[PDB]
Every structure is written in structure tokens, then in C-alpha cells.
Design a protein around this ligand. Structure first.
Ligand SMILES: [Ca+2]
Ligand SMILES: [Ca+2]
Ligand SMILES: [Ca+2]
Ligand SMILES: [Ca+2]
Ligand SMILES: [Ca+2]
Ligand SMILES: [Ca+2]
Ligand SMILES: [Ca+2]
Ligand SMILES: [Ca+2]
Ligand SMILES: [Ca+2]
Ligand SMILES: [Ca+2]
Ligand SMILES: [Ca+2]
Ligand SMILES: [Ca+2]
Ligand SMILES: [Ca+2]
Ligand SMILES: [Ca+2]
Ligand SMILES: [Zn+2]
Ligand SMILES: [Zn+2]
Lengths: 462, 462
């Protein structure tokens, strides 16, 4: 089966960052999402106790205004400033969006599950401008749930403008909810590296609690830091506390023209860098990546990674989530849909669209676009695709995957019954071309793509 | 796995009239839809010639006003009366709805592909009140396409009021389009019977061109005759001429409150008998069987048969068709959905609803209703069911299918991790109960049913 390069680019992108299933990546063992999640929850502790899973929690948090001591022995306490308060609340919300958690602020003398405070000096009273931050697991002991940040670091004081600050807040709150570093190390013990990782997917691409940069797994965020839980963090936190099924249950738009009211899902112009793993609990949803000019690769399959706005591996979709639609930008893109009915819009540029299973509606947009079919099940009669903007002599429909069972032949107006034949039928009253494919092994003609517009035999790649 | 009687009634109804696949039914070989279709098209002739498949046709028809002779040698020509003209046009439309055919009437001296005329006497000139009707295959010979009906039969003169007349018209037009009797016999040659059938599905339940009554295969139309192509006729006619993808591509309602403008799909009150195989080429469609009080069984799977309004095996869905929604009546019904997102409404009575795969929305209605789940894939987190009218202490949710992998246990607020556990979670802010099931072999909790209302542990059948 010598397939086309368009089909091959689909086949390959579908397998981008494959994981688990006895693979080995970077010479390391590969963990599935669930295995990573179990690893990141290995301490088996949460605010509900030890070995307690799937249980929701209503927690309190507090910005300490003074302290009698700090449990690590650091000193020079300094309270949260206004920007730190707002970003920390944004991090909290990023967790509660995905797991069944509620956060309620307390003040005064009230105790709280999670606290926030800065330090500036060590126990000897000397200025500390080297460290970053740390936090304590849930539990009943003194300091359980407390998180502490080095105020002499500008990223900690200005986390709204220095991405590592917000990231750090999300990470440390994670530990305070019960999550661990994917690998058994802790900042300040020798000189560990990614080579020390237990599993390949121990990196920022997969967990915001990882020690290691996204580059260690092949992703590239161009110097930016994602500020929200990543795919393995979502599975992990949900393991402890349950998934939040009330989040964004309407028709949700992620990227440009977003209606999320979440900074990490929202791009207001082309310079914005998106780094997120999406959680969405209902409705018909869209990845609008329309404002970028880079060549992008957008995959709608749950658990899968995309390359958006010039970054690599920066967008993923959490396990348990179904996103329905995608819009590329002016670059030459690949859009891969999932088993749901997807609307895909390639935008300008020469795009490759693959709707996969389900009744998909495809707009190639401006440019020389290619609509790819990988199997008879992609477009059955009972649930057929529409291609709604096909341009004869310009776009292509690619059926080369079918060569693996004998190359298709075109017929003009009738099928012979031998199978593996492709026919185009014009319906003048409606201006629709029906593309029929009689596949080997099928007694009846079971594959149909309807096209709003004319198409020529030479537009069809067999 | 001792499963519940509710689940068993689903499992069984899903296999109602199973066919093909090396089964033997009534001691005969069982044909799939496609095999029956090939058998019924065995003459391999159509208006496009011989051995020509999948090719559309634009045909003419004519009500002869006089004849020089009738090709069978019968005599006593009598032209169509007004009711015969209207019913014959209804039969023609029943064929063109399903296959790519157009029918245009001609008059005067113009030749036509299909003609209609009555006779009343044999070649000896004696009155014939015994025979019924006959027709001639497409071809170039004299009489090709002609159809002829015995005017001394009241069912032929009053086909709008005597169902066998309309049926006969649909049947004979079928032969004039190229279809054959499922078995090699012809009225007037000895005394054949269903025992002579080549395959089991040679009956009115499957083909309006069959010799044999629906009772021969276990169906029962209570003395009525279906007037429209049945499931094997649809596949057969489509084999010759192609499927008509422009038919009823909007949101179509079949049964009560129908918007089809087809008498055979329309019931205006509870005494109406429905007998149809549905063809539908797009949109979100409903089987509204709400006006009956009989216990009904309604299956939405393509190719499947239902028992509607007190009849058995009287409704089916053609291959290539996806119907999305179903409404039962006041009887105790079973509604089985398909892999699509289905809305099922049980109506009054004690109903069993099974949404199958996809994100289904279920209304049990009045009565003690049972919502049945047969597998983890019926209601995944990524595409979960809603039960929107659940009545605590009255309805049931049946998870007994899961016993085949160990009986589920209830847990109150947390999962242990051992799997096969079921949990109910109340969300007071929204008044929703989330039913979670942690299934054996699943590392994460992957099955969820959301319920608009409270539910008790004792409402859940494990
Ligand atoms: Ca949504
Ligand atoms: Ca969705
Ligand atoms: Ca593009
Ligand atoms: Ca799809
Ligand atoms: Ca394009
Ligand atoms: Ca284009
Ligand atoms: Ca598709
Ligand atoms: Ca429809
Ligand atoms: Ca439909
Ligand atoms: Ca009912
Ligand atoms: Ca379904
Ligand atoms: Ca009911
Ligand atoms: Ca009920
Ligand atoms: Ca379902
Ligand atoms: Zn850490
Ligand atoms: Zn006949």
C-alpha cells in the first residue's frame, strides 16, 4: 500500500506522542495517562485522608497576613501582594474547573486547608535569592497544605507578567491538594536530570508538577510556561477528587474568540502562546486557532496533542473529553477529527482535513485543500460526510488509503459489481456531487461523500 | 451471568429476526439483506440494460386510454379510473423516494417505459374474475414495462380502500422496474408454497414482491397489506438504480404527527395500521408511535424490525438509514436505540429504555420505567447519557449486564480502587445525581450517567 503523502501525514500525526502499551520513548518506559496519574498520586493522600479516591472536597484557602513561624524554618515572611492574590485565585480555579473541588477564602484567625505566604531569608537569617517555592501535602500536621514562595524572585512577585510565577503557583497548589512530582526527587538534593525520570512522559508537556522541561519529550513552548494543569495532572487530580462535570457544559470556544473567561484558553491576538490541556464537560465545542499564520496540526481525539500557533505539543485534550470542531489559520494545516460529527475549517492555506468516523462537515477554505478518507467507515451512507466548499480543479479528495485492498478505479455512470470502484454523480437540481465508493467485500454501495459543488474525476486521488 | 429480565428483553429484541451469517430459519437458509437483494435482482435487468448497476434513470409512465392488443392475450381492456390513477402515482412515488428514479407522465400517442391498464376477459373472450394482475420486465420488446390488472376484482378497482390493490400496484411496478419474485415461481403454475422458498426471508415482511404472507416468517399484520417497498425491496431497487439521497433530508417524523406527506408512514389515529420500511437520507428523525396503547417494541438500529401498534414485524429501517429518536405509547414498551445520540421517550406505561452507544437522553415518562445499560461503552464520560425524568422509588436503572465481569457493589462516597463499584453523587446546586461506575479493568472511572433528579441506592439494580 503506497499511500499519499497527505494520508501519511494524517496517519503519522494520529500517532504523535503515542504512549503506554509497552512502548519505550527516549529509552525510557512509556506510561499511559492512567499510569502517570497513579504515579503522580503515589502518596495516596488527599484532603479526604489516605487511600481515599473519587471523593469530592470543599476546601478553604487563606492569604496569611502574618505568621508565628514558617514550617520549613525559612524566615522573612512577607504576605501576598495584590497580583499574587489574583493569580493564585486563577490557579485555584484551574484546579476546581477539572476536579470536584470548591475553594472558599477565609480570613482573620480562621484555619484553612491551603495557605499562601512568601519568605525572603533562610533560618540563619541570611537573604535567600536562590530558591523558588515549596508546599506541604494534605494531612493533619502543622503546615499541612501550606505553600510558600520566595519574594526575592521577581517571577513570584509578578506572576501575572512572569509566566513561571503563575506556573509555580499552580504546581505548588497541586502538592497542597495531594499531587506529587512524577519522579522521586526534590529541589535541593544533588543534581538530578530527566535521565533520572522513571517514565518518559515526566515533563512539563504532561504534568505541571514535573521537574523537566517540555523539550525533554519533544515539545517546544518557545520559552513560555503553561500556567494550568496538563493532561496527566487532570487525570491525577480527578483520581483523588472526581471529575467536575459541571464545567463548560455549553458550546465552548477555545483559542481565538473564546468564551471561556480563562486566560490560559484565550488568545486575543496572534502573538499569544497557548499551552493548555482542555477539560470540558458537555456541549458542542470548538478549537478556534484561526488567528495564527503558522502551519498547525490540530487533533480532536481525546488524549491527543496538537501543535498550535508555532509551538509544538502545546495543546492537548484530557481523557474523558469530546471536542467537536476545529478552525485552522492561514498556514498549511492538518486537522484530524474524531469519531464524533466534526466541523472542520482549514482556513486559508493548503490544508489537509480528515474527518474520521462520524458525519463530518468539511470546509477546506481558501487554498488547495485535501480531504482525506482512511476507511469505508469514515463516510458510510447512514452517516455521510459533506464537503461544503469544494473547488473543482483546486481541491482534492484523497482515497489512496483504499489501495491496501486494491487500487480503486473510476467508473462513469455504473458499477460493474467487481468492487473497488469510485463514481461521481451530478445532481443538477441541487448542485451536489455524490461521490460513491463501492468497496471490496461490500455487497452494497456503502460509502458516500456529498459535495456542495462540482468535482472532476481528476480531483479524486485514487 | 444471571442478568435481569429487563436486560434480557433487550438482548433478545436486539436479535429479533436475525438473518444471514449461516443461520437457518424455518429450516431454510437465511439470506442477509444483500443476498435477498441480489436474489430479487437475479434477472440482472433494468431500464438501463442488462448487468447495469447503480445507474439512475428518468422514466415515463402512461395510463393507456385504449389498446390494439394486450401482450398476454387477455382482452376486455378497461382504462384506469380516477382512484387507480392516484394510488398508482402513490406507488410510483414510493419507489422514487428510495432509488434514483424520476417518473414523468406522458399522454396521447407517446410511448412510455411503464404503462397501466386493466383487462376483464381471457383470450377466449370469457369473463375472468379469478386472476389478479401481472407485469413485464424492462427491455426493448413489445409490452416491456407494461402492467395489467383485473378490473373484475374489487381490490383493483378500489385500491385506495382495499389495501391489496395498492400493494399489488407497488409489486407490479416493481417488476416493471426490473425486480423479480424472490423465488422461481409464477402465479398459475401448479400449487407452490412457502416451503418452496429458496430462503427464509421470502415473505411480505421483507419483500412486497414475495408470494408468501408475513405470517410465514413470524410477523403479523392483522389482515392488512403494506403498500410500500419493504426492506429487501429497497436494497434491491437501490442496487439497480442507486439510492436517492435527496429524500427527507430534514428532521422527519414517522407515525403519529408525521411530516412525511406519505400515507404509509402516517397514522392519524390509533386504529391506523403501520407497515413500512423507512428510507430517510438525512437529518434528525423520530419514530412517534405515541398514539397506540399496545405494548410495543421499537428498535432504531438500521436493518432492524419493530412491533408497532399491536402488529408484529411491521416496521423496519432500511440499510443505510439512521433514525435518531423514538416515542412509545401508553403501553409497556421496549425502546432500543442505536450507536447515535438518541432521545427516547417511553410514554405512559412501564417501559424499558436502552440507549446503547452514544450520548442518549432518556424520558421514562409516567409509569415504573427501567433504564438499561449493557456495557461500559453505553455511557462513557466523554459521551454520557442523561436521564431527564427519573423518579426515585419508582424507576430503575439496570446495571445487571455488568455481572458478567463480577457483580457491582455500591459505595457511598469513595471508590476503593478494586473496581466494579457504583456510586451516586448528589449535586445540590444543580439538583443532578451523577451515577459513576468504576468498571473492572479500567484504571480511571470511565462510565457516568447524569440524572436530572434524586435517585436512591435501591433504585439501582446491580
Ligand atoms: Ca463545552
Ligand atoms: Ca463536546
Ligand atoms: Ca489553514
Ligand atoms: Ca469525525
Ligand atoms: Ca485551505
Ligand atoms: Ca480550498
Ligand atoms: Ca467522517
Ligand atoms: Ca430525515
Ligand atoms: Ca437521521
Ligand atoms: Ca409506554
Ligand atoms: Ca444511542
Ligand atoms: Ca413510562
Ligand atoms: Ca417513570
Ligand atoms: Ca448511551
Ligand atoms: Zn514541586
Ligand atoms: Zn409478481
Amino acid at each position: 500500500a503506497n499511500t499519499s503523502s497527505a494520508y501519511n501525514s494524517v496517519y503519522d500525526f494520529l500517532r504523535y506522542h503515542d504512549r503506554g502499551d509497552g512502548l519505550t520513548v527516549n529509552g525510557k518506559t512509556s506510561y499511559s495517562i492512567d499510569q502517570a496519574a497513579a504515579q503522580i498520586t503515589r502518596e495516596n493522600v488527599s484532603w479526604n485522608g489516605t487511600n481515599v479516591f473519587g471523593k469530592s472536597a470543599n476546601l478553604t484557602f487563606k492569604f496569611l497576613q502574618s505568621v508565628s513561624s514558617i514550617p520549613s524554618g525559612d524566615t522573612g515572611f512577607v504576605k501576598f501582594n495584590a497580583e499574587q492574590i489574583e493569580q493564585a485565585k486563577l490557579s485555584l480555579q484551574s484546579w476546581s474547573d477539572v476536579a470536584n473541588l470548591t475553594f472558599t477564602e477565609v480570613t482573620g484567625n480562621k484555619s484553612a486547608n491551603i495557605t499562601f505566604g512568601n519568605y525572603t531569608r533562610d533560618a540563619s537569617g541570611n537573604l535567600d535569592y536562590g530558591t523558588q517555592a515549596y508546599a506541604y501535602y494534605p494531612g493533619n500536621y502543622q503546615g499541612a497544605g501550606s505553600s510558600w514562595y520566595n519574594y526575592n524572585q521577581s517571577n513570584i512577585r509578578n506572576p501575572g507578567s512572569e509566566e513561571y510565577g503563575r506556573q509555580t503557583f499552580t504546581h505548588k497548589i497541586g502538592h497542597a491538594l495531594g499531587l506529587a512530582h512524577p519522579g522521586e526527587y526534590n529541589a535541593g538534593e544533588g543534581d538530578p536530570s530527566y535521565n533520572d525520570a522513571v517514565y518518559a512522559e515526566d515533563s512539563y508537556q504532561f504534568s505541571i508538577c514535573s521537574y523537566w522541561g517540555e523539550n525533554e519529550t519533544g515539545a517546544d513552548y518557545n520559552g513560555h510556561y503553561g500556567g494550568a494543569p496538563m493532561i496527566d495532572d487532570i487525570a491525577a487530580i480527578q483520581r483523588l477528587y472526581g471529575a467536575n462535570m459541571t464545567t463548560r457544559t455549553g458550546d465552548s470556544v477555545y483559542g481565538f474568540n473564546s468564551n471561556t473567561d480563562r486566560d490560559f484558553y484565550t488568545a486575543t491576538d496572534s502573538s499569544k502562546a497557548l499551552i493548555f490541556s482542555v477539560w470540558d464537560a458537555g456541549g458542542t465545542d470548538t478549537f478556534d486557532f484561526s488567528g495564527y499564520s503558522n502551519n498547525q496540526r490540530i487533533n480532536l481525539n481525546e488524549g491527543s496533542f496538537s501543535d498550535v500557533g508555532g509551538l509544538k505539543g502545546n495543546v492537548s485534550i484530557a481523557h474523558g473529553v469530546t471536542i467537536e470542531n476545529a478552525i485552522g489559520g492561514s498556514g498549511n494545516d492538518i486537522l484530524v477529527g474524531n469519531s464524533a460529527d466534526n466541523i472542520l475549517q482549514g482556513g486559508a492555506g493548503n490544508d489537509v482535513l480528515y474527518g474520521g468516523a462520524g458525519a463530518d462537515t468539511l470546509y477546506g477554505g481558501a487554498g488547495r485543500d485535501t480531504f482525506v478518507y482512511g476507511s469505508g467507515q469514515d463516510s458510510t451512507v447512514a452517516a455521510y460526510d459533506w464537503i461544503a466548499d469544494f473547488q473543482k480543479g483546486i481541491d482534492k479528495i484523497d482515497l489512496s488509503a483504499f489501495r491496501n485492498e486494491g487500487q480503486l478505479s473510476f467508473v462513469q455512470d455504473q458499477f460493474t459489481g467487481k468492487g473497488q470502484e469510485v463514481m461521481l454523480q451530478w445532481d443538477a437540481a441541487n448542485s451536489i456531487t455524490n461521490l460513491w465508493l463501492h468497496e471490496a467485500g461490500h455487497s452494497s454501495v456503502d460509502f458516500l461523500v456529498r459535495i456542495v459543488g462540482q468535482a472532476a474525476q481528476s480531483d479524486i486521488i485514487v
